[PDB]
Design a binder for this molecule. Sequence first.
Ligand SMILES: N#CCSc1nc(-c2ccccc2)cc(=O)[nH]1
Ligand SMILES: [Cl-]
Ligand SMILES: [Mn+2]
Ligand SMILES: [Mn+2]
Ligand SMILES: [Zn+2]
Ligand SMILES: [Zn+2]
Length: 457
Amino acid sequence: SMFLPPPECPVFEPSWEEFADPFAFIHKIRPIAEQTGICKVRPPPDWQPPFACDVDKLHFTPRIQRLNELEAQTRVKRDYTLRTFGEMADAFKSDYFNMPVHMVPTELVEKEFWRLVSTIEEDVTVEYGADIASKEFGSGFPVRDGKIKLSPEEEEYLDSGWNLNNMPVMEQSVLAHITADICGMKLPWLYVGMCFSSFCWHIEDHWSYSINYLHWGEPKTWYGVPGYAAEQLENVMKKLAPELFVSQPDLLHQLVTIMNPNTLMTHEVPVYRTNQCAGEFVITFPRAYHSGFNQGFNFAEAVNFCTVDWLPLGRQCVEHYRLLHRYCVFSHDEMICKMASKADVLDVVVASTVQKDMAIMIEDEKALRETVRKLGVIDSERMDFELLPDDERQCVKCKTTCFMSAISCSCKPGLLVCLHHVKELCSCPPYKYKLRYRYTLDDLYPMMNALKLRAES
Ligand SMILES: N#CCSc1nc(-c2ccccc2)cc(=O)[nH]1
Ligand SMILES: [Cl-]
Ligand SMILES: [Mn+2]
Ligand SMILES: [Mn+2]
Ligand SMILES: [Zn+2]
Ligand SMILES: [Zn+2]
């Protein structure tokens, strides 16, 4: 009546054999889970990573959060220890309900969350932690270091595929051999939650997958939307909260919001829910919108990742970003070429998939270069784009991160446009322009061939 809970998302309980390889398992469940956008994974009963921490030495800077539906919030950026945060969080919840924190039904907290964010009268504010691992607050999974000797139990999980520190650097991921500095995206994030602290509706940068583990504490409640419904969700959001779609100045100025899933379901957006309990994984699929809130004091860890399934979507995403003039986190083409340059050490299924994306890349690049030559750009010079700081190689028009090529003019020292935007650089005639290119077509075809050879083994 007030709140109707979405249907439950799929839950998987893999055997140890199924569970052992995360990439194989994810690939297996994909036909099911990509229809719901999120799914939950319960590890085999004895997969039990050790959690040990001194709650008095772990400290972090809390973020503060107002809970109002449709109100704009920014995506990223006082001091608590984990103990004092926990004490604040438990006291907040038990005072809010006049009940012991674990006797509050999850259904009631959910019901109450959607009441309070919708009511103008209520101004509930809460606090939470969000950051990558640091020396003041490290991963919840075991990691190697010289100062501290690990237990056999800890040593056991150092190399698990489901140890999220490993996830980026494994063989079936395509961020395995990448060099670029993208700390925000390839490293796990740590999240300290409290009752009602929430994550707004969003998809991951570059439409990547995410995997999310709840180390300990009260559950995390999720809502998820399949990738095929992303634009329908965005249309609903645009109608109700147009303020969120204004042009973003920087990459750290993305606007996001809380919105009732019933509102989406009313507008024919399929939504699924789940309560993630301690020791369970949630996986989000490419372009799957998700949001949620915490039932109480808890500690989660999450990481982005990209499988071979994702590669063509990664290309479509960058294209989508260009149309929106949205900043990129990294160059997709640069990643592809980096992998091609390491074709000999690539996993062979990876090589095969990269080869297919590269073929599309080369065909598109060939066409774009013919077009800019017909616009009268004649002069050219090789340019090592990967050496430029990222904010020094964005298209002044569409903000895309250049790598394959760009146009420059000595009239505008340091400015670049991608080849879709030759006419947006300056008023000089095109013969004053230079095509800056990373590779000639004669460079590119042998790189692609190396991938083919590797994939033919
Ligand atoms: N999405 C996702 C991972 S779960 C999570 N994510 C957050 C969050 C996300 C973006 C920015 C700040 C916090 C808070 C929290 O409790 N849990
Ligand atoms: Cl409110
Ligand atoms: Mn997310
Ligand atoms: Mn020059
Ligand atoms: Zn451009
Ligand atoms: Zn000029």
